[PDB]
Short mmCIF file of C-alpha atoms and ligand atoms in Angstrom, two decimals:
data_model
loop_
_atom_site.label_atom_id
_atom_site.label_comp_id
_atom_site.label_asym_id
_atom_site.label_seq_id
_atom_site.Cartn_x
_atom_site.Cartn_y
_atom_site.Cartn_z
CA UNK A 30 -0.01 -0.01 -0.29
CA UNK A 31 4.03 1.85 -0.10
CA UNK A 32 3.11 3.23 -3.36
CA UNK A 33 -0.93 4.26 -3.20
CA UNK A 34 -0.08 6.30 0.72
CA UNK A 35 1.65 8.93 -1.20
CA UNK A 36 -0.52 11.03 -2.84
CA UNK A 37 -3.16 10.41 0.10
CA UNK A 38 0.00 12.56 2.46
CA UNK A 39 0.42 14.90 -0.92
CA UNK A 40 -2.77 16.25 -0.88
CA UNK A 41 -5.40 18.70 1.00
CA UNK A 42 -8.52 18.58 2.67
CA UNK A 43 -7.06 16.97 6.31
CA UNK A 44 -8.13 13.95 6.99
CA UNK A 45 -6.99 12.70 4.13
CA UNK A 46 -3.54 13.74 4.98
CA UNK A 47 -4.30 13.08 9.36
CA UNK A 48 -5.92 9.46 8.06
CA UNK A 49 -3.28 8.83 5.40
CA UNK A 50 -1.01 9.83 8.50
CA UNK A 51 -2.53 7.63 11.06
CA UNK A 52 -2.57 4.98 8.60
CA UNK A 53 1.47 5.15 7.33
CA UNK A 54 1.71 5.29 11.94
CA UNK A 55 1.22 2.00 12.35
CA UNK A 56 2.99 0.56 9.01
CA UNK A 57 6.37 1.59 10.87
CA UNK A 58 5.03 0.01 13.86
CA UNK A 59 5.26 -3.42 12.09
CA UNK A 60 8.93 -3.75 10.38
CA UNK A 61 7.05 -5.99 7.62
CA UNK A 62 5.78 -2.72 6.74
CA UNK A 63 8.23 -0.27 8.60
CA UNK A 64 10.66 -1.80 6.08
CA UNK A 65 9.25 -1.43 3.36
CA UNK A 66 8.18 2.53 4.35
CA UNK A 67 13.14 3.54 4.15
CA UNK A 68 12.66 1.50 1.30
CA UNK A 69 11.31 3.94 -0.90
CA UNK A 70 11.81 7.53 -1.25
CA UNK A 71 8.48 8.69 -1.37
CA UNK A 72 7.11 7.91 1.52
CA UNK A 73 9.91 8.63 3.39
CA UNK A 74 10.02 12.53 1.43
CA UNK A 75 5.76 12.77 2.07
CA UNK A 76 6.07 12.49 5.50
CA UNK A 77 8.77 15.66 5.91
CA UNK A 78 6.49 17.46 3.56
CA UNK A 79 3.43 16.63 6.11
CA UNK A 80 4.95 17.15 9.05
CA UNK A 81 6.89 20.85 9.41
CA UNK A 82 4.13 22.26 6.56
CA UNK A 83 0.78 20.31 8.60
CA UNK A 84 -1.85 21.91 11.02
CA UNK A 85 -3.12 19.65 12.74
CA UNK A 86 -1.49 18.41 16.57
CA UNK A 87 -2.02 14.54 15.60
CA UNK A 88 -0.80 14.20 11.98
CA UNK A 89 2.31 16.23 13.77
CA UNK A 90 2.34 13.72 16.15
CA UNK A 91 1.34 10.29 14.53
CA UNK A 92 4.96 12.14 11.50
CA UNK A 93 7.57 12.79 13.94
CA UNK A 94 6.10 9.44 15.35
CA UNK A 95 6.62 7.26 11.71
CA UNK A 96 10.33 9.71 11.69
CA UNK A 97 11.52 8.44 14.43
CA UNK A 98 9.89 4.78 13.75
CA UNK A 99 12.11 5.02 11.35
CA UNK A 100 15.51 6.68 12.84
CA UNK A 101 16.28 3.14 14.85
CA UNK A 102 17.86 1.51 11.35
CA UNK A 103 20.63 1.94 9.31
CA UNK A 104 18.74 2.79 5.63
CA UNK A 105 16.06 4.64 8.21
CA UNK A 106 17.94 6.59 8.69
CA UNK A 107 20.29 8.41 5.71
CA UNK A 108 16.56 7.99 4.98
CA UNK A 109 15.42 10.37 6.88
CA UNK A 110 19.58 11.90 6.65
CA UNK A 111 18.88 11.97 2.57
CA UNK A 112 14.86 13.01 2.02
CA UNK A 113 16.23 15.90 4.42
CA UNK A 114 14.26 15.42 7.15
CA UNK A 115 16.94 17.32 9.51
CA UNK A 116 15.50 20.98 8.60
CA UNK A 117 12.14 19.79 9.86
CA UNK A 118 12.81 18.16 12.75
CA UNK A 119 14.91 20.96 13.75
CA UNK A 120 11.62 23.37 12.61
CA UNK A 121 9.73 20.60 14.75
CA UNK A 122 11.80 21.88 17.94
CA UNK A 123 9.93 24.60 17.67
CA UNK A 124 6.36 23.17 18.48
CA UNK A 125 3.57 23.38 21.72
CA UNK A 126 3.28 20.51 22.25
CA UNK A 127 5.28 17.86 23.92
CA UNK A 128 5.17 14.48 22.31
CA UNK A 129 6.58 15.99 19.09
CA UNK A 130 9.40 17.65 20.44
CA UNK A 131 10.22 14.39 22.24
CA UNK A 132 10.30 12.72 18.75
CA UNK A 133 12.54 14.89 16.88
CA UNK A 134 14.39 15.30 19.37
CA UNK A 135 15.91 10.76 19.85
CA UNK A 136 15.40 10.93 16.16
CA UNK A 137 18.41 13.90 15.43
CA UNK A 138 19.50 12.11 18.58
CA UNK A 139 19.74 9.21 17.18
CA UNK A 140 21.18 10.86 13.77
CA UNK A 141 23.67 13.12 15.48
CA UNK A 142 24.39 9.26 17.14
CA UNK A 143 25.12 7.09 13.63
CA UNK A 144 24.54 9.00 10.68
CA UNK A 145 27.13 10.92 9.00
CA UNK A 146 27.86 14.28 8.45
CA UNK A 147 23.98 15.00 10.80
CA UNK A 148 26.54 16.56 13.14
CA UNK A 149 27.01 19.08 10.19
CA UNK A 150 23.78 19.28 8.92
CA UNK A 151 22.12 19.57 12.42
CA UNK A 152 24.63 22.76 12.57
CA UNK A 153 23.81 25.04 9.59
CA UNK A 154 19.98 24.17 9.67
CA UNK A 155 20.09 25.33 13.32
CA UNK A 156 20.12 23.05 15.51
CA UNK A 157 21.73 23.99 18.25
CA UNK A 158 20.32 27.99 19.32
CA UNK A 159 16.64 25.79 19.33
CA UNK A 160 18.25 22.57 22.19
CA UNK A 161 19.72 25.53 24.27
CA UNK A 162 15.68 26.46 24.16
CA UNK A 163 14.63 23.94 24.66
CA UNK A 164 17.24 23.48 27.99
CA UNK A 165 14.03 25.79 29.96
CA UNK A 166 12.30 22.15 29.59
CA UNK A 167 11.30 19.84 33.10
CA UNK A 168 11.31 15.86 31.92
CA UNK A 169 15.22 15.01 32.75
CA UNK A 170 14.81 11.74 29.94
CA UNK A 171 14.12 15.01 27.15
CA UNK A 172 16.95 17.41 29.22
CA UNK A 173 19.36 14.18 29.66
CA UNK A 174 18.94 13.71 25.36
CA UNK A 175 18.84 17.78 24.56
CA UNK A 176 22.57 17.68 26.03
CA UNK A 177 23.90 14.92 24.65
CA UNK A 178 22.89 15.87 21.74
CA UNK A 179 24.62 19.18 22.46
CA UNK A 180 27.83 17.57 23.83
CA UNK A 181 28.24 15.95 20.87
CA UNK A 182 27.96 18.38 18.24
CA UNK A 183 29.44 21.16 21.06
CA UNK A 184 33.20 18.27 21.03
CA UNK A 185 35.99 18.76 19.33
CA UNK A 186 33.80 22.18 17.45
CA UNK A 187 34.96 26.06 18.24
CA UNK A 188 32.30 28.02 15.89
CA UNK A 189 29.68 25.30 17.29
CA UNK A 190 30.51 25.98 21.43
CA UNK A 191 29.96 29.76 20.12
CA UNK A 192 27.30 29.54 19.72
CA UNK A 193 25.34 27.36 22.40
CA UNK A 194 27.64 30.26 24.48
CA UNK A 195 25.27 33.29 22.00
CA UNK A 196 22.18 30.94 22.84
CA UNK A 197 22.26 31.28 26.82
CA UNK A 198 23.66 27.66 26.77
CA UNK A 199 25.63 28.08 30.39
CA UNK A 200 23.21 30.01 32.40
CA UNK A 201 20.43 26.93 31.06
CA UNK A 202 23.08 24.20 31.16
CA UNK A 203 23.70 25.66 35.59
CA UNK A 204 20.95 25.32 36.06
CA UNK A 205 20.29 22.35 35.21
CA UNK A 206 22.78 21.06 37.76
CA UNK A 207 21.14 22.85 40.42
CA UNK A 208 18.25 21.28 40.19
CA UNK A 209 18.25 18.02 39.12
CA UNK A 210 19.71 14.58 40.31
CA UNK A 211 19.13 12.50 37.62
CA UNK A 212 22.85 11.44 37.24
CA UNK A 213 22.97 10.49 33.18
CA UNK A 214 21.22 13.84 33.20
CA UNK A 215 23.36 15.68 35.28
CA UNK A 216 26.85 13.46 34.15
CA UNK A 217 25.69 14.48 30.31
CA UNK A 218 25.30 17.76 31.11
CA UNK A 219 28.70 17.99 33.05
CA UNK A 220 30.13 16.77 30.19
CA UNK A 221 27.87 19.60 28.06
CA UNK A 222 29.74 21.70 30.46
CA UNK A 223 33.23 20.71 30.31
CA UNK A 224 33.40 21.27 26.57
CA UNK A 225 33.25 24.82 26.87
CA UNK A 226 35.04 25.77 29.90
CA UNK A 227 38.06 24.82 27.63
CA UNK A 228 36.51 27.88 25.91
CA UNK A 229 37.91 31.42 26.98
CA UNK A 230 34.50 32.64 25.95
CA UNK A 231 32.46 30.72 27.94
CA UNK A 232 34.56 30.52 30.91
CA UNK A 233 33.56 33.90 31.89
CA UNK A 234 29.73 32.72 30.95
CA UNK A 235 29.75 29.95 33.21
CA UNK A 236 31.27 31.10 36.32
CA UNK A 237 28.78 34.47 35.87
CA UNK A 238 25.53 32.15 35.65
CA UNK A 239 26.69 30.37 38.99
CA UNK A 240 28.68 27.65 37.77
CA UNK A 241 31.39 26.90 40.34
CA UNK A 242 28.65 25.94 43.31
CA UNK A 243 26.53 24.63 40.82
CA UNK A 244 29.02 22.28 40.05
CA UNK A 245 30.12 23.13 44.14
CA UNK A 246 26.23 21.06 45.10
CA UNK A 247 27.60 17.69 42.97
CA UNK A 248 31.37 16.92 44.06
CA UNK A 249 29.95 14.20 47.09
CA UNK A 250 27.91 12.07 44.22
CA UNK A 251 28.48 8.61 44.43
CA UNK A 252 28.02 8.96 40.43
CA UNK A 253 32.71 8.80 39.76
CA UNK A 254 32.39 10.15 36.34
CA UNK A 255 30.35 12.52 37.30
CA UNK A 256 32.09 14.06 40.78
CA UNK A 257 35.11 14.47 38.58
CA UNK A 258 33.16 15.65 35.54
CA UNK A 259 32.36 18.78 37.39
CA UNK A 260 36.13 18.51 39.23
CA UNK A 261 37.28 19.41 35.64
CA UNK A 262 35.10 21.53 34.79
CA UNK A 263 35.38 23.37 37.72
CA UNK A 264 39.51 23.16 37.22
CA UNK A 265 39.35 25.46 34.28
CA UNK A 266 36.87 28.18 35.02
CA UNK A 267 39.00 28.05 38.29
CA UNK A 268 41.50 30.81 37.35
CA UNK A 269 37.81 33.54 36.21
CA UNK A 270 36.14 33.11 39.32
CA UNK A 271 38.41 35.05 41.39
CA UNK A 272 35.66 37.47 42.66
CA UNK A 273 32.41 34.55 42.95
CA UNK A 274 31.09 35.49 46.30
CA UNK A 275 28.98 32.01 48.56
CA UNK A 276 32.00 29.54 47.02
CA UNK A 277 32.02 28.07 51.61
CA UNK A 278 30.59 25.27 50.61
CA UNK A 279 33.06 24.49 47.49
CA UNK A 280 36.12 25.40 49.38
CA UNK A 281 35.47 23.49 51.55
CA UNK A 282 34.54 20.49 49.70
CA UNK A 283 37.65 20.94 47.94
CA UNK A 284 39.69 21.16 51.51
CA UNK A 285 38.12 17.59 52.69
CA UNK A 286 38.64 16.16 48.29
CA UNK A 287 42.06 16.76 49.50
CA UNK A 288 42.53 13.23 51.19
CA UNK A 289 41.83 11.60 48.31
CA UNK A 290 42.81 8.34 47.31
CA UNK A 291 41.61 9.04 43.55
CA UNK A 292 45.27 10.30 41.95
CA UNK A 293 43.28 12.93 39.61
CA UNK A 294 40.85 14.04 42.20
CA UNK A 295 43.61 15.21 44.35
CA UNK A 296 45.47 17.14 40.93
CA UNK A 297 41.87 19.68 40.70
CA UNK A 298 41.06 19.92 44.50
CA UNK A 299 43.65 21.01 44.37
CA UNK A 300 44.25 22.75 41.21
CA UNK A 301 40.37 24.72 41.60
CA UNK A 302 41.73 25.59 45.15
CA UNK A 303 44.97 26.97 43.97
CA UNK A 304 43.55 29.37 40.99
CA UNK A 305 40.47 30.18 44.56
CA UNK A 306 43.26 31.92 46.48
CA UNK A 307 44.97 33.78 43.88
CA UNK A 308 44.37 37.40 45.29
CA UNK A 309 40.73 36.95 47.55
CA UNK A 310 41.74 37.18 50.75
CA UNK A 311 37.93 36.64 51.21
CA UNK A 312 38.88 32.35 50.18
CA UNK A 313 42.34 32.59 51.44
CA UNK A 314 40.42 33.21 55.59
CA UNK A 315 37.33 30.09 54.67
CA UNK A 316 40.05 27.71 53.32
CA UNK A 317 42.75 28.27 56.55
CA UNK A 318 39.34 27.87 59.07
CA UNK A 319 38.43 24.23 57.56
CA UNK A 320 41.85 23.48 57.96
CA UNK A 321 43.46 23.88 54.77
CA UNK A 322 46.93 24.66 55.39
CA UNK A 323 46.80 20.30 56.91
CA UNK A 324 45.47 19.14 53.77
CA UNK A 325 48.00 20.45 51.87
CA UNK A 326 50.81 20.06 53.81
CA UNK A 327 49.58 16.23 53.98
CA UNK A 328 48.47 16.15 50.46
CA UNK A 329 52.21 17.67 49.41
CA UNK A 330 54.19 14.59 52.06
CA UNK A 331 51.69 12.09 49.68
CA UNK A 332 52.58 13.59 46.17
CA UNK A 333 56.36 12.72 46.32
CA UNK A 334 57.68 13.55 43.14
CA UNK A 335 54.46 13.81 41.63
CA UNK A 336 54.92 18.45 40.06
CA UNK A 337 51.11 17.73 38.64
CA UNK A 338 49.87 17.51 42.20
CA UNK A 339 52.78 19.94 44.68
CA UNK A 340 52.79 22.62 42.00
CA UNK A 341 48.41 23.85 42.26
CA UNK A 342 48.74 22.81 46.27
CA UNK A 343 52.05 24.54 46.78
CA UNK A 344 50.94 27.80 44.67
CA UNK A 345 48.05 27.37 46.86
CA UNK A 346 49.95 27.41 50.33
CA UNK A 347 51.91 30.37 48.83
CA UNK A 348 48.51 32.03 48.57
CA UNK A 349 47.47 30.63 51.95
CA UNK A 350 50.36 31.96 53.39
CA UNK A 351 50.83 36.50 52.58
CA UNK A 352 48.55 39.44 52.05
CA UNK A 353 45.17 38.72 54.02
CA UNK A 354 44.13 37.81 58.20
CA UNK A 355 45.67 34.04 59.00
CA UNK A 356 48.78 34.53 57.23
CA UNK A 357 50.53 34.68 60.00
CA UNK A 358 48.85 31.23 61.83
CA UNK A 359 48.74 29.78 58.26
CA UNK A 360 52.97 30.85 58.12
CA UNK A 361 53.27 29.15 62.00
CA UNK A 362 50.03 26.08 60.44
CA UNK A 363 53.27 24.69 57.87
CA UNK A 364 55.74 24.19 60.67
CA UNK A 365 53.47 22.84 62.44
CA UNK A 366 51.91 20.56 60.50
CA UNK A 367 54.89 19.41 60.36
CA UNK A 368 55.35 20.75 56.59
CA UNK A 369 58.28 22.83 56.19
CA UNK A 370 61.49 20.37 55.61
CA UNK A 371 58.97 19.13 52.06
CA UNK A 372 59.07 22.62 51.63
CA UNK A 373 62.21 22.91 51.51
CA UNK A 374 63.04 19.83 49.36
CA UNK A 375 60.99 20.50 46.55
CA UNK A 376 64.21 23.44 46.14
CA UNK A 377 65.99 21.00 44.56
CA UNK A 378 65.35 18.17 41.79
CA UNK A 379 64.06 16.58 40.41
CA UNK A 380 61.85 19.53 40.95
CA UNK A 381 61.03 21.69 37.92
CA UNK A 382 61.51 25.33 36.98
CA UNK A 383 57.33 25.93 37.75
CA UNK A 384 57.53 23.88 40.61
CA UNK A 385 61.41 24.91 42.22
CA UNK A 386 59.11 29.03 41.67
CA UNK A 387 55.86 28.35 43.37
CA UNK A 388 58.74 27.17 46.53
CA UNK A 389 60.69 29.47 46.24
CA UNK A 390 57.06 32.17 46.62
CA UNK A 391 56.73 30.39 49.56
CA UNK A 392 59.18 29.58 51.43
CA UNK A 393 59.49 34.37 50.86
CA UNK A 394 56.58 33.69 52.72
CA UNK A 395 57.40 31.16 55.59
CA UNK A 396 60.72 33.19 56.52
CA UNK A 397 58.17 36.03 58.05
CA UNK A 398 57.31 34.34 59.87
CA UNK A 399 60.46 33.81 63.11
CA UNK A 400 59.83 31.33 64.11
CA UNK A 401 60.64 29.45 61.13
CA UNK A 402 64.39 30.90 60.79
CA UNK A 403 65.57 28.25 62.30
CA UNK A 404 64.46 25.00 60.60
CA UNK A 405 64.09 26.61 57.54
CA UNK A 406 68.06 26.68 58.16
CA UNK A 407 68.78 23.29 59.33
CA UNK A 408 66.57 22.18 55.66
CA UNK A 409 69.58 23.99 53.93
CA UNK A 410 67.24 26.16 52.18
CA UNK A 411 70.03 29.30 52.60
CA UNK A 412 72.94 27.08 50.16
CA UNK A 413 70.03 26.68 47.95
CA UNK A 414 68.19 29.74 47.01
CA UNK A 415 71.65 30.95 47.37
CA UNK A 416 72.31 27.83 44.70
CA UNK A 417 69.12 28.94 42.71
CA UNK A 418 70.02 32.47 42.53
CA UNK A 419 72.97 31.64 40.58
CA UNK A 420 72.45 29.74 38.04
CA UNK A 421 69.56 32.15 37.65
CA UNK A 422 71.40 35.38 37.50
CA UNK A 423 73.63 33.66 35.07
CA UNK A 424 71.19 32.75 31.88
CA UNK A 425 69.74 36.83 32.49
CA UNK A 426 73.93 37.37 31.49
CA UNK A 427 73.03 35.88 28.23
CA UNK A 428 73.75 38.94 25.45
CA UNK A 429 62.19 31.87 29.68
CA UNK A 430 63.20 28.65 30.52
CA UNK A 431 60.43 26.39 31.05
CA UNK A 432 57.88 28.73 30.99
CA UNK A 433 59.40 30.88 33.75
CA UNK A 434 60.45 33.78 34.04
CA UNK A 435 64.49 33.72 34.76
CA UNK A 436 64.93 36.48 36.65
CA UNK A 437 61.75 36.20 38.35
CA UNK A 438 63.58 33.25 40.27
CA UNK A 439 66.89 37.03 40.44
CA UNK A 440 63.29 37.69 42.40
CA UNK A 441 62.15 35.45 44.10
CA UNK A 442 65.68 33.43 45.43
CA UNK A 443 67.04 37.00 46.25
CA UNK A 444 63.96 37.92 48.23
CA UNK A 445 63.59 34.76 50.01
CA UNK A 446 67.50 35.36 50.64
CA UNK A 447 66.39 39.47 51.59
CA UNK A 448 63.53 38.22 54.28
CA UNK A 449 66.00 35.40 56.12
CA UNK A 450 68.95 38.24 56.51
CA UNK A 451 66.53 39.66 59.88
CA UNK A 452 67.87 36.28 61.56
CA UNK A 453 71.48 36.36 62.94
CA UNK A 454 72.29 32.75 62.12
CA UNK A 455 70.74 32.88 58.57
CA UNK A 456 73.09 36.52 57.92
CA UNK A 457 76.53 34.42 58.96
CA UNK A 458 75.70 31.47 55.97
CA UNK A 459 74.42 34.03 53.76
CA UNK A 460 77.78 36.05 54.09
CA UNK A 461 80.05 32.72 53.84
CA UNK A 462 78.43 31.54 50.95
CA UNK A 463 80.80 34.06 49.02
CA UNK A 464 77.04 36.05 47.81
CA UNK A 465 78.04 40.00 48.47
CA UNK A 466 79.73 39.94 45.09
CA UNK A 467 76.30 39.09 43.38
CA UNK A 468 74.46 41.77 45.95
CA UNK A 469 77.04 44.37 44.34
CA UNK A 470 76.02 43.31 40.67
CA UNK A 471 72.82 43.69 40.53
CA UNK A 472 72.40 46.87 42.02
CA UNK A 473 73.14 46.80 37.83
CA UNK A 474 69.73 45.35 37.30
CA UNK A 475 67.71 48.32 35.39
CA UNK A 476 64.47 45.31 36.56
CA UNK A 477 63.69 47.76 39.72
CA UNK A 478 61.96 44.86 40.98
CA UNK A 479 65.33 43.23 41.23
CA UNK A 480 67.44 46.71 42.76
CA UNK A 481 65.66 46.44 45.73
CA UNK A 482 65.34 42.58 47.11
CA UNK A 483 69.51 42.63 46.04
CA UNK A 484 69.77 45.91 48.25
CA UNK A 485 67.18 44.65 50.93
CA UNK A 486 69.13 42.04 51.67
CA UNK A 487 72.42 44.20 51.60
CA UNK A 488 71.22 46.64 53.96
CA UNK A 489 70.05 43.58 56.36
CA UNK A 490 73.63 42.04 55.84
CA UNK A 491 75.41 45.42 57.03
CA UNK A 492 74.54 45.52 60.29
CA UNK A 493 78.10 43.54 61.25
CA UNK A 494 80.68 45.95 60.13
CA UNK A 495 82.17 42.77 59.19
CA UNK A 496 80.34 42.21 56.10
CA UNK A 497 80.11 46.09 55.41
CA UNK A 498 83.15 46.49 54.65
CA UNK A 499 83.02 43.70 52.46
CA UNK A 500 80.30 45.52 51.00
CA UNK A 501 81.65 48.33 50.16
CA UNK A 502 84.96 46.48 48.88
CA UNK A 503 82.66 45.35 46.12
CA UNK A 504 82.41 49.04 44.39
CA UNK A 505 78.50 49.63 46.43
CA UNK A 506 78.98 52.68 47.33
CA UNK A 507 79.08 54.60 43.73
CA UNK A 508 75.04 52.55 42.03
CA UNK A 509 73.72 52.69 46.38
CA UNK A 510 75.01 56.66 46.08
CA UNK A 511 73.06 56.80 42.43
CA UNK A 512 70.09 54.42 43.44
CA UNK A 513 69.20 57.24 46.61
CA UNK A 514 67.59 59.45 43.41
CA UNK A 515 65.67 55.82 41.92
CA UNK A 516 62.15 56.78 40.24
CA UNK A 517 61.21 53.69 42.46
CA UNK A 518 60.51 54.77 46.70
CA UNK A 519 61.32 51.45 47.65
CA UNK A 520 65.15 51.29 46.91
CA UNK A 521 65.95 54.57 47.86
CA UNK A 522 64.42 53.82 51.20
CA UNK A 523 66.52 50.22 51.09
CA UNK A 524 69.80 52.09 49.56
CA UNK A 525 69.57 55.18 52.13
CA UNK A 526 69.84 52.41 54.63
CA UNK A 527 73.40 50.44 53.40
CA UNK A 528 74.91 53.22 53.07
CA UNK A 529 73.86 54.43 56.28
CA UNK A 530 74.53 51.08 58.20
CA UNK A 531 77.75 51.73 56.29
CA UNK A 532 79.26 54.05 59.29
CA UNK A 533 81.84 53.50 60.33
CA UNK B 30 66.79 56.42 63.74
CA UNK B 31 64.73 58.81 60.83
CA UNK B 32 67.02 56.24 57.88
CA UNK B 33 66.73 52.69 58.82
CA UNK B 34 61.99 53.42 60.66
CA UNK B 35 62.07 54.71 57.08
CA UNK B 36 63.40 50.51 55.75
CA UNK B 37 61.44 48.89 57.88
CA UNK B 38 58.95 50.20 57.20
CA UNK B 39 59.12 50.27 53.13
CA UNK B 40 60.50 46.38 54.25
CA UNK B 41 56.30 45.73 55.66
CA UNK B 42 55.09 46.40 52.05
CA UNK B 43 57.39 44.67 49.78
CA UNK B 44 56.53 41.46 51.94
CA UNK B 45 53.29 41.61 54.63
C1 WHL C 24 61.63 57.12 54.13
C2 WHL C 24 59.94 56.56 54.73
O1 WHL C 24 59.79 56.64 55.03
N1 WHL C 24 59.95 55.93 54.03
C3 WHL C 24 58.90 54.59 53.45
C4 WHL C 24 58.01 54.55 54.01
C5 WHL C 24 57.05 53.67 53.56
C6 WHL C 24 56.91 53.46 52.70
N2 WHL C 24 55.58 52.40 52.74
C7 WHL C 24 55.39 51.43 51.86
O2 WHL C 24 55.76 51.37 50.29
C8 WHL C 24 54.30 51.42 51.12
C9 WHL C 24 57.86 53.51 51.57
C10 WHL C 24 58.59 54.07 51.83
#
């Protein structure tokens, strides 16, 4: 009856197409007849023309249901695809009744999963915009199919991620994250957000929509694939969420998550916490109150050579030990939690430059606490900081290694030595390493920040007349008198200080 | 004195 049935759909009068629709639908639920529907292109075409032109809701539900049943096999799938189907079901994603909406999204989903060239076809028809507009629906199974469709198209396609963003993608995807509990929908939604989080233009939109807090709600779910997709997305956005409020719950969970047995969970937790504590005084406190210093120290002790874990954890320790209230107590807490020996050890190989630069800054802030001077000394921090300073300064004299700025090590090492020189015992070790020639040669550096730490460590060393004479013997008076009129006030203050202690 | 209290004030600025 297939040859005759194409005409009843290519004909006016409702019931004629309606009956035919409520007649081809039945020839679709039976395998013998259905095998003949896909076999005929005139049939397949006629149902597409009827579906996207119909006025009656039963024809729309019966047609879209017929092509949905066609989409379960390869020959029917490409029959939909070849007869210009995808543009029609994309149109049907704007229907006001839920039956055709369900039928269209499942047929498009099957095409996106099993039809070659359907991802390009759906993209061009404006599918991404329609799929995002459907994210406000309430059927979680419908939402699970719709978000998986978006994931199929957004994955590895930059143009797709931009279109999703322009349609309010992040906010609608974040809303799903903080509303529903169906694991498959949460896991699929998290896949979409993970794909979007690697795009710099989607990063602030997900953050501004509250996506950080929304992902934190599911960090304790029993689904391992859901927590890790949540953690990967949080890691990506972390650098663009340093201003968000309401981070108390998320930060609390991340601190607890540092003790996880899973390697990927710990790495992500340290990475998120590092970025989240950077220049956010409020985050620095909250992490300290939930005992983050202890957690990060134990995390570092557990990692050993795993630099993908120690680099972010030490960064977070560096953030939590400076420029906020509890920084003083956080400086003591690293020592009281048996952290000092591991920090100094990480200055030595096989640590690479990213880890070293982060460790130096931590030691710099750790040295602000005078109770850390002796235990840092007995770990060998002074000769190692000088070894790094000499090598870094030797490289800048060639007239960027491992991604780090080589003069940033000169500023960081000399600055840490400046702090340590506050203690008299440390001064002995600094002086005994033949470093005064190096500290005077750094006064001729053009980088104002290097001139400051150099004059600083020279100022502390000059408390002792023997050291002040050696410094004078290296011809420091001339660059110091010039640095008196430096545009940088901190250098002029430091330069005046070294010249003053040269009283004898 | 004078020059030294200058230094301690600029030292707190540099790190604390
Ligand atoms: C001479 C003097 O008082 N110098 C001085 C005072 C304060 C500061 N403070 C900061 O830089 C924050 C610098 C230099």
